[PDB]
Design a protein around this ligand. Structure first.
Ligand code: SRN
Length: 50
DNA sequence: CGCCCGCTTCGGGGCAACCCTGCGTCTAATACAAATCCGGCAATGGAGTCAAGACCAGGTTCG
C-alpha cells in the first residue's frame, strides 16, 4: 500500500484499488499447512485427542 | 648502581566453520524475416501375394 500510494494518481484511487489481500491469505494458508505448530489430530482413542 | 632490548607469556582480536531470532506483480507491443512443421497429392519401385502350373519319386492300387 505504501508503495502504490505514490505511483498511483490521486483523484482516481480507492481502497478497492489500494488493497492486495493475497499476501495475507498466503500467510494464513502458509501457517495452517506446513508449520511446526499445525499438526494432524492424533486420534486413535478419545484420550489421545484430548 | 641504572638502563635497553629482544624473548617469552598471556590477551585480545580476528577469523574460519555451522544454524533461523531466516524464509513480492510490475509498460506493451508492432514489424518482419527466417526456419520449420505439416498436409496433401505425385512420381514411383521393390517387396509381398495369388494362382496356375509344371517338376518327377516313391508309396499305392490295379493288370
Ligand atoms: C518433534 C516434534 C513433533 C513430532 C513429529 C511428534 C512428537 C515427538 C515426541 C514423541 O516422540 O512423542 C515437535 O513438535 C512441535 C514442533 C517441533 C517438533 O516438530 C518437528 O520438527 C517434526 C514435525 C512437525 C509437523 C508435521 C506435520 C505433519 O507430518 C504428518 C502430518 C502432520 O503431523 C505429523 C503428525 C503429528 C502428531 C504426532 O503426535 C504424537 C504421536 C505421533 O508421533 C504423531 C501422530 C503424540 O505424541 C502427540 O500427542 C504429541 C505431539 C507433540 C506436540 C507438538 C510439539 C512441538 C505427521 C507425521
Amino acid at each position: 500500500v505504501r508503495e502504490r500510494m505514490t505511483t498511483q494518481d490521486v483523484e482516481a484511487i480507492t481502497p478497492q484499488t489500494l488493497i492486495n489481500i493475497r499476501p495475507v491469505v498466503a500467510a494464513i494458508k502458509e501457517f495452517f499447512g506446513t508449520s511446526q505448530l499445525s499438526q494432524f489430530m492424533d486420534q486413535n482413542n478419545p484420550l489421545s485427542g484430548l
